[PDB]
Amino acid sequence: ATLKEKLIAPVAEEEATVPNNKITVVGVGQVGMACAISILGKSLADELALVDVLEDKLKGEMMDLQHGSLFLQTPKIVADKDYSVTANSKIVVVTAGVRQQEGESRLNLVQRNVNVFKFIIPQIVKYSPDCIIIVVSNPVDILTYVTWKLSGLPKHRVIGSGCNLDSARFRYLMAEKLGIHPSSCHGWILGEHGDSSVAVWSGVNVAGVSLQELNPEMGTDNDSENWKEVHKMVVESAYEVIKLKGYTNWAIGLSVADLIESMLKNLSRIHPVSTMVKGMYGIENEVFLSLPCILNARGLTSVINQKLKDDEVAQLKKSADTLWDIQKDLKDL
Amino acid sequence: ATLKEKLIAPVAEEEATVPNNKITVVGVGQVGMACAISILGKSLADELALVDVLEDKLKGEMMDLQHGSLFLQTPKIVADKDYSVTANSKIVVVTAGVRQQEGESRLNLVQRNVNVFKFIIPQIVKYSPDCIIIVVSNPVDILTYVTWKLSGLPKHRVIGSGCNLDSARFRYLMAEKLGIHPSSCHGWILGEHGDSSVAVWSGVNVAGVSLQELNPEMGTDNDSENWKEVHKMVVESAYEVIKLKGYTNWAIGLSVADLIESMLKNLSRIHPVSTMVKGMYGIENEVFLSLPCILNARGLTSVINQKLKDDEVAQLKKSADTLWDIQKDLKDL
Amino acid sequence: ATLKEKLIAPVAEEEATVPNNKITVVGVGQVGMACAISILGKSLADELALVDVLEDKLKGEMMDLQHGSLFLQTPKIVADKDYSVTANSKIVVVTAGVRQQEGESRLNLVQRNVNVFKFIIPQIVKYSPDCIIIVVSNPVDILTYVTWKLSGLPKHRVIGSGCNLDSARFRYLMAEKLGIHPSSCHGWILGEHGDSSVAVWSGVNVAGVSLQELNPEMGTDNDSENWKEVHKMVVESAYEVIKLKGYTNWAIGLSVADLIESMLKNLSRIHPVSTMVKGMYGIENEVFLSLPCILNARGLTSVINQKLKDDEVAQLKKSADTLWDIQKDLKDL
Amino acid sequence: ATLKEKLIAPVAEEEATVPNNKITVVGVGQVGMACAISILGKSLADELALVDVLEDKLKGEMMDLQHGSLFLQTPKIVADKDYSVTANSKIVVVTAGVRQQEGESRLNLVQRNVNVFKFIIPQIVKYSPDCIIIVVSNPVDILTYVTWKLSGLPKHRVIGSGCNLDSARFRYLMAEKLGIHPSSCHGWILGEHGDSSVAVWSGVNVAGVSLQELNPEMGTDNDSENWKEVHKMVVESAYEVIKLKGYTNWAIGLSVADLIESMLKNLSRIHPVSTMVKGMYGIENEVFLSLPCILNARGLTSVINQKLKDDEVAQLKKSADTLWDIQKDLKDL
Ligand SMILES: NC(=O)C1=CN([C@@H]2O[C@H](COP(=O)(O)OP(=O)(O)OC[C@H]3O[C@@H](n4cnc5c(N)ncnc54)[C@H](O)[C@@H]3O)[C@@H](O)[C@H]2O)C=CC1
Ligand SMILES: NC(=O)C1=CN([C@@H]2O[C@H](COP(=O)(O)OP(=O)(O)OC[C@H]3O[C@@H](n4cnc5c(N)ncnc54)[C@H](O)[C@@H]3O)[C@@H](O)[C@H]2O)C=CC1
Ligand SMILES: NC(=O)C1=CN([C@@H]2O[C@H](COP(=O)(O)OP(=O)(O)OC[C@H]3O[C@@H](n4cnc5c(N)ncnc54)[C@H](O)[C@@H]3O)[C@@H](O)[C@H]2O)C=CC1
Ligand SMILES: NC(=O)C1=CN([C@@H]2O[C@H](COP(=O)(O)OP(=O)(O)OC[C@H]3O[C@@H](n4cnc5c(N)ncnc54)[C@H](O)[C@@H]3O)[C@@H](O)[C@H]2O)C=CC1
């Protein structure tokens, strides 16, 4: 006597189903929604859950995505301040907290976002004990460490976005120089996300041609190709976008969807994301820095061993000391 | 001597090139940027141009998109306040609009958007004489008429977003009720975008099964399936999203990229978009209302003829009267 | 130290993994390989298993797909005459058997397939007890019933290709007549695959406009648009392709990949596939005929009830009698 | 009143539109149809034209693809023995092959193809004066020269498949040793397609880590990883597939669709295809060999300069001498 009962005859008994490829995005700000629309555009989720503390914005974002359902392949979009909505996620993307603000210190940003992660991370693993967490919130290397400690997950299931976007920006800047697609330019930005990153000059190449062999002054102060400036522009181009539009979100959203594609399609592609690097390159503390990592359906299963130069190792160790000096004073992790 | 000279040997001489599939988005607000990221995600553009009056925000958006180039298939992303940047676009998406002032009247807000269009639309056609224009800006049926008048373009090359999003919402809400994908739920919202739209109950079907034959009280006040309430929610769900997050953008972005895909791939798919309906359903003035329209590489080349019911025709005629009453009082078109 | 040992440092311990979306194709003939290339081009499989009795052809097909891996997103392609290679498949596509030289179907021909399927189907469920089976082998409605009986699976997990391809050909022919994309042409070919199929004229529509309402003579000899001839061409166009190239494969490959996409993305999209229709439209025997069915991650979970005409119901009953006449004399089920 | 006249009201007058991204495949054999299905699956063509000398098989392949139209985004699929069908193609794929007689000199086999190509190639350029020609037919380096000479086209519009598939198989074999996606493996097979190709060991890398740096014996007769055997497997794996299934087609079809994607999307990606290499690496004759080439909408616009070792340059020069030894004796070019 219901329309649905006149129209639809069951062949299977209706039952509780669990999604096969559920993704949660925590924080529905600029970055969380760029992540959400990128995941939906690539059809990466059979179920998308959104969480924030702003219950009205959260409901509005959920409804706006639902209204686009005809154009997508995600049959369930749900949102709630309550983490019960996130249950049985395969991947949880954490974009929550506050951006850096002009006039505020790096310590200040650590205190604001560690406060947020202390509430969020235990809730995530309560409902999705088997998930992979992708940490995007800044400062990303500290917050990846904080996530690993609070989550109790194994290292291979806690991934910092780290230098993934730095590398994508570097390959774009190379591409601009040469007039070719960034996918045909190869080069790795590793270590700490942003100011103190390492450009691995020996690896920079097109079609396997070492650009450091063609220009041995690459990365020195006596270089007519000014590669040191290109490395600086990886950092400075982001600050410029932040000054101009207030934040960055589109490139980070696409880069997060690209990580998720590698994992849910079980591809074992190599990405410069952040992993726990104690015992690598002489690092003696528990810190997360970016190295070329293999990603697949298990998470971050392997790292590439590189022949890093003494100056490259020296920067990784100084980064590890800077991170550890902040981390050793964090309480209740 | 330059790295590029050492690395790259020309086979062809460098030459002045014209993009084959250039798209321009006018307005880099939350709607324009949802259009841009949806266009880029579907690889619909070999060149994307952005235009706005906010020079810094425009540059920041352009740079953020460029930083994501590794993940895309759009070799040229450009932005400027000067419409020369839009030259040789195949498709121009207009999302430009002003912010309401505190307590500003409703016909005043219309006149201010019309004054924006009096500058923008002649510039668009100056630089892209061969383009198709998609109008998204509100009020969308009026601003589609304005664009048509100011552009001097034939009616097959000016397309209002109209009820494209209203029909996507309808198919979502009917899909939610039935537990099926919205692509398997068929139903048309026509006429005026928003409050005065027409739900064509007689066409609402699943697998060619008329839901109105199953439930003959569909659309009436004596209906246990409350279909009139579903039509109400098509209108009200949009106001609710605006109340909750301040605006809508994700669904409109996806719907616009769906229209562009029909045109650039020359598919002749049918979409409920706004066209110039003088001479249809007893309408005797130049107004734009939504009907099922065939879209391909020439633009909007055909409309589907419906036998509409008396109440459905009455509402289209009342809508045409409302739009013409506003239009006949606009100057310098 | 192997290359792998110098180059790749483990983060996670090495472990076997169960694929999340493994597909098996049984039979690497023209149809089997069209299904495989369509499955791989849509990235629907994280593991693809191929089975055949021709060991050299099987290994050759496996290697040729593997050589294309750079261009795909399927990290494991395996092939063996032994069904152990098929373990833990979500979906198994059965294309094995004999194909028509021109076209027929009779008790003895089906007993030869039952002889083939009697070995294949128990092997499939032995290694993938939780799979969904898509039957493509002709005669497809009888062999869907045979697969169901031999498998012991519930009816929601055994799906016949049925009239999925017939309906696609119908929508192509409608599109050629009207000059619109087939996705904008709606029409359902139901019942038996091939000669005795039913064209549900009542459901044929563009944009919800009933073409039978514009032409109430549609499907009779009272008809100047000769829609009866379009239905004839759905049947004959297949025989014509077999005449001209020896077999058909591309359209069936694409249509099978479309069914798989609905199920692995859990979409609940509606397709005209073959299901067990005992107790529908007065059918009294266990036979498989095509109706509009909902497909998702559970398999075929529902059927759409339609307001079918007396002559359409007579045809389903006669088809049922025809299939039951054959099945009742099959042995070793 | 035709059905179409009652249903569809023109907004623009009906007009003949020149397709924007038309592709022609010459030869509808195993390789041609692999190219066609990959082109269609990636939505690269608004019009696909097929040409062959076998009228029935050509028409059958055309009809089978048309019957899959619902599942594609190519609104026009055409086929004819007459090259008029190919008019206004952006790209033409040549897979047309005569088979070598079992007591036949290599000069005779190529002259047999020249007698065929002497009709095909002029006919292609007559109907598509602006086209890019991709030559797939074996022997591929000689036939690319023949195509260039007969076409009158500049070097940048004639592309030999060359070592494109050799490099894809090399990356697959690297990837199988490491358990990673072939896209994360980098290595270049250059020069002559097949037995005499050059593996550029100095460019073989993962994440910019030189495998020759890790193993300086890479490619020598004192090599514990036996990379010489991996290079042999690149050649031999193809002969193995021919022995096992009669031919290769799937990997070649995916590789051609990837080249087409670079050019139609104007990406300037680098591919190891065959270009006219007179005046490079001391080569003094008009021959085609594979180098890393930049592909975009103009065709092959640029080549990457490598620092090749003396033994690599000597092999390029030898290959050039072998090709020129045959070409100098060809008549009617
Ligand atoms: N790793 C990288 O490469 C990049 C990192 N980011 C970082 O991503 C983060 C997000 O940036 P935006 O989205 O622009 O910020 P935003 O201010 O637009 O969004 C942050 C959201 O987090 C929510 N939030 C705050 N506390 C929360 C809690 N306890 N639980 C749940 N949600 C909570 C807020 O309500 C807000 O909606 C920042 O830390 C930013 O620095 C941004 C760009 C790139
Ligand atoms: N038709 C539909 O279904 C929908 C229509 N819309 C409409 O889309 C429009 C855009 O909305 P939002 O992005 O949220 O607004 P917004 O105010 O955030 O962005 C509009 C942009 O237009 C720019 N603009 C103003 N004057 C300009 C000029 N002369 N040239 C170029 N750009 C100029 C502004 O600087 C601003 O960046 C509005 O009219 C909105 O109502 C909104 C959603 C759905
Ligand atoms: N349902 C539909 O809409 C369509 C159905 N078909 C049917 O698909 C089937 C396959 O046709 P084609 O691929 O053209 O035939 P084919 O002869 O090219 O391939 C059949 C393959 O099955 C293999 N095979 C036979 N017995 C086997 C066994 N016991 N175990 C494993 N493999 C076995 C053969 O060795 C061969 O490789 C036929 O029954 C054909 O009529 C084809 C077109 C459309
Ligand atoms: N470069 C590479 O890496 C690869 C190249 N190939 C080559 O591709 C070619 C095609 O191989 P298959 O498709 O397996 O052969 P096939 O024999 O299956 O198909 C060849 C087709 O060309 C047609 N043809 C012959 N002469 C013609 C003419 N004058 N005009 C038009 N069509 C004509 C034939 O009728 C036939 O349909 C061969 O030369 C083969 O060696 C094969 C795979 C890899």
Numbering used by the authors:
A (entry chain A), B (entry chain B), C (entry chain D), D (entry chain C): 2 to 334
Sentences from the paper on this structure:
There were two tetramers for the binary complex and one tetramer for the quaternary complex in the asymmetric unit. The average root-mean-square deviation (RMSD) values between the monomers in the asymmetric unit were 0.5 and 0.3 Å for two tetramers of the binary complex and one tetramer of the quaternary complex, respectively. The binding conformation of NADH with the enzyme was essentially identical between the binary complex and the quaternary complex, and their binding interactions were consistent with those of published structures. In contrast, in the binary complex, the active-site loops were partially disordered with an open conformation for the two tetramers in the asymmetric units, except for two of eight monomers in which the loop was well ordered owing to crystal packing. A structural comparison between our quaternary and binary complexes revealed that the active-site loop, referred to as the substrate-specificity loop, exhibited closed and open conformations during the binding and release of substrates, respectively. The superimposition of our two structures clearly indicated structural changes corresponding to AXKO-0046 inhibition. Significant structural differences were observed around the active-site loop, with a maximum RMSD of approximately 7 Å for the main-chain atoms. Other marked structural deviations, except for the active site, were observed in the two helices near the active site (residues Trp228–Lys246 and residues Asp311–Asp330), with a maximum RMSD of approximately 2 Å for backbone atoms.
